[PDB]
Amino acid sequence: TDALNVLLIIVDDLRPSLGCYGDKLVRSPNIDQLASHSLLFQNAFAQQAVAAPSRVSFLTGRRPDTTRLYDFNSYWRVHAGNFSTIPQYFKENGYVTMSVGKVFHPGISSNHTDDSPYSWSFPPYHPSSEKYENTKTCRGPDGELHANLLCPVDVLDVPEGTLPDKQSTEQAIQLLEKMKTSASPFFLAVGYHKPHIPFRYPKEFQKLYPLENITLAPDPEVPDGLPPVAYNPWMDIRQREDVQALNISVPYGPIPVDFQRKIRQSYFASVSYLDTQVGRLLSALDDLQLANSTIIAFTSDHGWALGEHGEWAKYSNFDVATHVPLIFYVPGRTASLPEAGEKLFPYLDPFDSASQLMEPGRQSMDLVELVSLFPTLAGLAGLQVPPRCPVPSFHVELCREGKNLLKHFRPGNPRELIAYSQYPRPSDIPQWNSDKPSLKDIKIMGYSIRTIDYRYTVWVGFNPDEFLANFSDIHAGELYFVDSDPLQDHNMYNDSQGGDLFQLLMP
Amino acid sequence: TDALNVLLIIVDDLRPSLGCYGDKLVRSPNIDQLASHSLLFQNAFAQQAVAAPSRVSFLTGRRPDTTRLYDFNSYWRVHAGNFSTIPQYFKENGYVTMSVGKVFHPGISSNHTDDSPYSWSFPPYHPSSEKYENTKTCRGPDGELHANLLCPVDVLDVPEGTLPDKQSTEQAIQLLEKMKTSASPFFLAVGYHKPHIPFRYPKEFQKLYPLENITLAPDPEVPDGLPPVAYNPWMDIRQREDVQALNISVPYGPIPVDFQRKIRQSYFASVSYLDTQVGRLLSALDDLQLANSTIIAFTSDHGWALGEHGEWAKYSNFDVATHVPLIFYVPGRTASLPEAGEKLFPYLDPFDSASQLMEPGRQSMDLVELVSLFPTLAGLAGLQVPPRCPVPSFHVELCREGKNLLKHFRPGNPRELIAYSQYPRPSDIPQWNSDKPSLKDIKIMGYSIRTIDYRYTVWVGFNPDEFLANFSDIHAGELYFVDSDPLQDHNMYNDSQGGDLFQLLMP
Ligand SMILES: *[C@@H]1O[C@H](CO[C@@H]2O[C@@H](C)[C@@H](O)[C@@H](O)[C@@H]2O)[C@@H](O[C@@H]2O[C@H](CO)[C@@H](O)[C@H](O)[C@H]2NC(C)=O)[C@H](O)[C@H]1NC(C)=O
Ligand SMILES: *[C@@H]1O[C@H](CO[C@@H]2O[C@@H](C)[C@@H](O)[C@@H](O)[C@@H]2O)[C@@H](O[C@@H]2O[C@H](CO)[C@@H](O)[C@H](O)[C@H]2NC(C)=O)[C@H](O)[C@H]1NC(C)=O
Ligand SMILES: *[C@@H]1O[C@H](CO[C@@H]2O[C@@H](C)[C@@H](O)[C@@H](O)[C@@H]2O)[C@@H](O[C@@H]2O[C@H](CO)[C@@H](O)[C@H](O)[C@H]2NC(C)=O)[C@H](O)[C@H]1NC(C)=O
Ligand SMILES: *[C@@H]1O[C@H](CO[C@@H]2O[C@@H](C)[C@@H](O)[C@@H](O)[C@@H]2O)[C@@H](O[C@@H]2O[C@H](CO)[C@@H](O)[C@H](O)[C@H]2NC(C)=O)[C@H](O)[C@H]1NC(C)=O
Ligand SMILES: *[C@@H]1O[C@H](CO[C@@H]2O[C@@H](C)[C@@H](O)[C@@H](O)[C@@H]2O)[C@@H](O[C@@H]2O[C@H](CO)[C@@H](O)[C@H](O)[C@H]2NC(C)=O)[C@H](O)[C@H]1NC(C)=O
Ligand SMILES: *[C@@H]1O[C@H](CO[C@@H]2O[C@@H](C)[C@@H](O)[C@@H](O)[C@@H]2O)[C@@H](O[C@@H]2O[C@H](CO)[C@@H](O)[C@H](O)[C@H]2NC(C)=O)[C@H](O)[C@H]1NC(C)=O
Ligand SMILES: *[C@@H]1O[C@H](CO)[C@@H](O[C@@H]2O[C@H](CO)[C@@H](O)[C@H](O)[C@H]2NC(C)=O)[C@H](O)[C@H]1NC(C)=O
Ligand SMILES: *[C@@H]1O[C@H](CO)[C@@H](O[C@@H]2O[C@H](CO)[C@@H](O)[C@H](O)[C@H]2NC(C)=O)[C@H](O)[C@H]1NC(C)=O
Ligand SMILES: *[C@@H]1O[C@H](CO)[C@@H](O[C@@H]2O[C@H](CO)[C@@H](O)[C@H](O)[C@H]2NC(C)=O)[C@H](O)[C@H]1NC(C)=O
Ligand SMILES: *[C@@H]1O[C@H](CO)[C@@H](O[C@@H]2O[C@H](CO)[C@@H](O)[C@H](O)[C@H]2NC(C)=O)[C@H](O)[C@H]1NC(C)=O
Ligand SMILES: *[C@@H]1O[C@H](CO)[C@@H](O)[C@H](O)[C@H]1NC(C)=O
Ligand SMILES: *[C@@H]1O[C@H](CO)[C@@H](O)[C@H](O)[C@H]1NC(C)=O
Ligand SMILES: *[C@@H]1O[C@H](CO)[C@@H](O)[C@H](O)[C@H]1NC(C)=O
Ligand SMILES: *[C@@H]1O[C@H](CO)[C@@H](O)[C@H](O)[C@H]1NC(C)=O
Ligand SMILES: [Ca+2]
Ligand SMILES: [Ca+2]
Ligand SMILES: [Cl-]
Ligand SMILES: [Cl-]
Ligand SMILES: [Cl-]
Ligand SMILES: [Cl-]
Ligand SMILES: [Cl-]
Ligand SMILES: [Cl-]
């Protein structure tokens, strides 16, 4: 009897545009193969659709209103409370805990040291080539180098001759090889960068998605019923040279159709590129015979809009921005243990037109939240599940605000039917800082309820000095029905009275 | 080590107009003395403010939408499911279970046998003199007999020379004396009739409340903001001779001021009369030395309006109609065990101007529901608490839809902050059957949420054939704030958006 290892894979800005989530266009064979042996959650949502707030949230197991982190300019241990993290908890239980890539958000939100010395057994590894993502590293048709958003590259024509996710994969494999020697179990967090912007990927992956076979989003127009307060102006992508040359109006655009399809091409190519890296990582896990002793959690910190509602990027409460993939492989529970010389995660080449997305593994339609990642991994690994947090929990160091999802591997509280998301705004009209408002400039907080049936959102007055929401100062509301309006194009909040919330509360 | 006895006292139509609930006018010294040794719940509410629906609810531990009993014309075991009752459960655990007075509602709702043979050890006792309550038994100033609503009587001038609650008290005492012999513990349910109409009580109690020192209700007018659908026309009291002679308009009245004060006099007198009966019962319990081995639960099936909002009687979702008293005496837990020859419930005479309401015993402001009576008594008595019901539970015989209140004797689910009530209507405009609509005539169901902060009610379309509420067909709504509008005179539903419900759902 031993304790199970944990491989936590985090992808930056990855929406569930994956074969195992019903996407019949994107080629993600390696991730789909992971799902075939795993429990896949169809309705998992981040608590805020932006990096640091989401990562600090699900790494401490607390919600944004407990971390009080809505931008990226505060360290929770000083700002809110001495909250323990997932890797800190495993390390305190005899694990060797290791970080590769973007797990914590860099900077002050992790005290510039990836939350040292609490979380990790040694100073994390961050790939060097990431610092060239936003340099003049994209060679164009006429031979010059540019800082482009769409950046298919020959690896032999970029600085250091590599890409950050290839480095992370390589380093993760070496650490896996090392841990096969150690007597201690490992908790390995690998944080991949793509498909986060810019879309810098080996140019060969672009051939998987010719533009002729690329369509726009189903709902590229800005909906009439979308209140301006809920719109994010996607300002960061406007700074890239190729985007800047199109002279796209602020804040509503639209992006020219031809470039919209090019964005979707490069995003899809980056996903398939990401998928091969995951393939290499999981394949090495198989070769090392760790598949029967290692939990594998695969998820993302938030989604990314690709033209839906005339929106791009995250910074939103729409499903496209909050819906994330969430897959859990548990040796001998989500699948039969691998027998003699059996391989569960053999590398699959997206350039091979074969098979049929494999079969969908276990699936769950329950509404779940990233803030449940902490208790789930602690339970799946055989450790003590931290207790439920009181309200408030600024003074508690080890507790969880999310539910454990272990029951899903074999009394109806209404909150178990809800995935919560939120996002701040500095004003009602989209302006320069509406994507990523700093704490002092937040004046509105949009709180959103997502059920199997609808998304209910209210944009309410917010006081950043007292961290106080005023649910009597509702600036605007949104109500989208999954059955009739899955794309969320027809806001029904004005025609509503609140009977949907009453119904949810009524036993 | 032994099991504790249970004395469950139920009062028909008793609102918390009691000294131990802050009423500085009504004299209820014996009940207040029970409270001084008990845990008193300040915010307990029935699930529907009318007899059979409420009694079948809290006796089976299920809600009205599980019993599907909204009138008094169906037996749950045939109509909904083979639901077990509190006394049935105790009897199955070696208790002698006994019923005196109105515990179950008589008629088909209890199969005309008080739910025989499941609930009781022998056919219950019902006082004979109750059948004279609605006869010409009230002697008037000119010497004739009338069927009056206000019925102060000399006991020597009524049929059989007694009153139903005196008989019940006497019979309960005899059963207590008998059980002091038995080796088995007892579960004794005593159901008192007054202050249910008519107000027939020993006329001496009328002297405790001279009319000069009687005021009207604080809010005797019908509020402008009260939707007609939520108004009950109080038709039953209009049939009494003294009421009929005033020629009170239907359905809004008002009742003449002088008669309003007379109603309140007779109600208060009936409460003090009830209190002495409780005094006799509890005093006999003390004399028999059962105070250290007997749980005592005191409550009511619902309230009664005394002019608030121009309303009278129950059939309502207002606090006055749904708020009930709820007191739990637990030997050695809510108070120190009685030592040698100590008496905890000595009879107190309301005609003695002495003391000062005693001291308030333990108190709890948590919002609780009568449907929690089943699990609480089962726990307090040392028995296994039935499990929480699934949804739906028509097929389950033993389970509870309410929470156990044992924690109150030494994760925040929003439903633990709510007491639920409801009431049906046959139409929006008050009509002949708006007080007590029969199932087939129900077209609207008013669902109400009560928190520490507000009461939120929606009157929605209801289909009695499918037992289906349509929360998209809201006929009207109500929102009353406890802090600013404790009397519930200023409906704020039209100025509201639903942010109060959202706030309750948001962790
Ligand atoms: C913040 O907490 C860390 C570690 O918390 C540990 O785990 C918690 C679940 C709880 O059990 C704590 O009591 C644990 O200490 C603190 O780091 C410890 O600091 C003490 C002295 O300050 C030191 O002796 C320990 O070795 C440290 N342990 C670790 C794992 O680093 C830290 O001090 C806390 N910070 C504040 C400001 O309270
Ligand atoms: C947050 O980090 C600071 C600084 O971390 C130090 O410097 C980094 C570059 C890196 O090398 C870390 O490993 C270092 O610990 C912490 O402030 C330092 O705390 C130590 C106490 O161990 C003290 O000796 C130093 O003087 C401090 N440095 C400064 C500039 O004040 C700080 O404690 C960390 N916050 C928390 C909550 O742990
Ligand atoms: C929380 O909000 C309430 C309500 O906000 C008001 O109504 C909104 C629709 C919008 O018009 C706001 O600008 C309004 O202020 C605030 O209640 C107001 O309080 C002020 C000052 O006390 C008073 O002058 C107004 O009359 C109040 N309005 C109402 C409708 O009650 C309340 O002040 C806010 N609380 C905090 C702490 O900011
Ligand atoms: C309705 O239930 C009664 C009693 O239910 C009992 O308690 C429940 C918690 C559960 O444990 C049941 O299995 C128990 O029986 C049934 O009454 C019993 O009926 C059987 C034969 O029908 C008889 O042998 C038992 O002695 C009866 N027990 C009692 C206490 O009366 C009754 O049959 C059920 N009715 C229907 C229609 O299902
Ligand atoms: C509901 O009650 C009826 C009738 O109860 C009988 O008659 C009463 C006056 C009283 O004396 C009760 O104790 C009697 O049991 C039940 O119908 C009877 O069921 C018995 C089976 O025990 C059968 O022999 C009789 O013929 C039935 N009588 C009639 C008129 O049909 C009925 O079973 C009870 N319902 C439930 C769910 O228990
Ligand atoms: C449940 O209620 C909806 C909504 O009720 C409608 O709106 C109310 C304000 C009131 O005006 C009602 O009379 C309305 O019917 C019902 O939806 C309606 O369904 C009918 C028939 O399918 C259709 O003709 C209407 O256009 C619908 N109206 C809306 C606003 O959607 C629904 O039918 C009810 N469900 C059941 C089972 O009765
Ligand atoms: C929902 O209703 C609100 C208000 O009822 C609408 O916002 C109003 O828009 C008008 C212009 O048409 C302005 O003059 C008002 O000042 C606005 N009201 C407030 C409170 O700001 C909103 O446009 C409606 N939305 C939809 C989709 O119909
Ligand atoms: C997981 O599977 C591998 C290979 O299938 C197992 O490898 C064995 O490991 C033990 C010690 O861990 C060695 O003594 C054996 O020689 C290895 N090979 C075989 C064929 O057993 C590994 O033990 C498995 N892990 C667990 C926890 O059962
Ligand atoms: C709350 O609003 C509703 C509707 O907005 C009011 O009901 C309306 O009353 C008018 C008469 O003033 C009728 O002509 C309408 O037909 C009613 N509407 C509906 C949907 O029936 C209601 O009176 C308002 N209540 C308060 C207290 O202001
Ligand atoms: C409750 O108190 C009474 C009197 O204070 C106790 O009465 C005793 O009962 C036992 C058997 O039940 C007799 O043997 C004694 O003679 C009785 N008198 C005394 C003074 O003990 C009674 O036992 C108490 N009940 C419990 C459960 O402790
Ligand atoms: C688009 O897909 C179809 C279906 O396989 C394929 O035949 C066609 O060649 C694709 N388009 C291009 C430009 O390759
Ligand atoms: C961009 O467009 C605006 C008007 O839409 C025009 O005034 C401006 O000169 C344009 N800029 C460039 C660089 O084309
Ligand atoms: C009303 O109460 C006061 C206060 O005790 C008392 O003095 C007065 O006599 C009472 N009224 C009547 C009519 O007795
Ligand atoms: C009752 O009052 C109505 C008018 O308010 C009148 O028509 C009727 O005759 C009165 N009935 C009696 C019995 O006084
Ligand atoms: Ca991100
Ligand atoms: Ca009653
Ligand atoms: Cl990194
Ligand atoms: Cl170029
Ligand atoms: Cl596409
Ligand atoms: Cl009776
Ligand atoms: Cl007379
Ligand atoms: Cl009064």
Author numbering:
A (entry chain A), B (entry chain A): 34 to 443, 454 to 550
Sentences from the paper on this structure:
Hunter syndrome, also known as Mucopolysaccharidosis type II (MPS II, OMIM 309900), is an X-linked lysosomal storage disease caused by genetic deficiency of the enzyme iduronate-2-sulfatase (IDS, EC 3.1.6.13), required for the step-wise degradation and recycling of complex glycosaminoglycans (GAGs). IDS belongs to the sulfatase family of enzymes and catalyses hydrolysis of the C2-sulfate ester bond at the non-reducing end of 2-O-sulfo-α-L-iduronic acid residues in dermatan sulfate and heparan sulfate. Despite low sequence identity, the overall fold and domain organization bears a striking core resemblance to other human sulfatases. IDS adopts a compact, globular α/β sandwich fold, comprising residues 34–550.
Here we report the X-ray crystal structure of human IDS with a sulfate ion bound covalently in the active site. The crystal structure of IDS was refined at 2.3 Å resolution. The enzyme is monomeric with a single-polypeptide chain in the asymmetric unit. Lack of interpretable electron density prevented the modelling of one loop region (residues 444–453). Continuous electron densities were observed adjacent to all asparagine residues involved in N-linked glycosylation, and at least one N-acetylglucosamine moiety linked to the nitrogen of the asparagine side chain was built at each predicted site. FGly functions catalytically as an aldehyde hydrate (FGly aldehyde-hydrate, FGH) with two geminal hydroxyl groups; here we observe what we have interpreted as a covalent sulfate-ester intermediate (FGly sulfate, FGS) in the IDS active site, which could originate from natural substrate encountered in cells during expression. The covalent linkage is unambiguous, with a distance of 1.5 Å between the sulfur atom and the FGS ester oxygen. Extra electron density for a metal ion was observed next to the modified FGS residue. This was modelled as Ca2+, coordinated by one nitrogen and five oxygen atoms with approximate octahedral geometry: one oxygen each from the side chains of D45, D46 and D334; two sulfate oxygens from FGS84 and one nitrogen from the side chain of H335. Side chains of conserved H138 and H229 likely play important roles in catalysis, making direct contacts with the free geminal hydroxyl of FGS and a sulfate oxygen (OS3) of FGS, respectively. The arrangement of the IDS active site is compatible with the consensus TE mechanism, hence we propose a similar mechanism for IDS in which FGH84 performs an SN2 nucleophilic attack on the sulfur atom to generate the covalent FGS adduct, followed by elimination of bound sulfate and rehydration of the resultant FGly aldehyde.
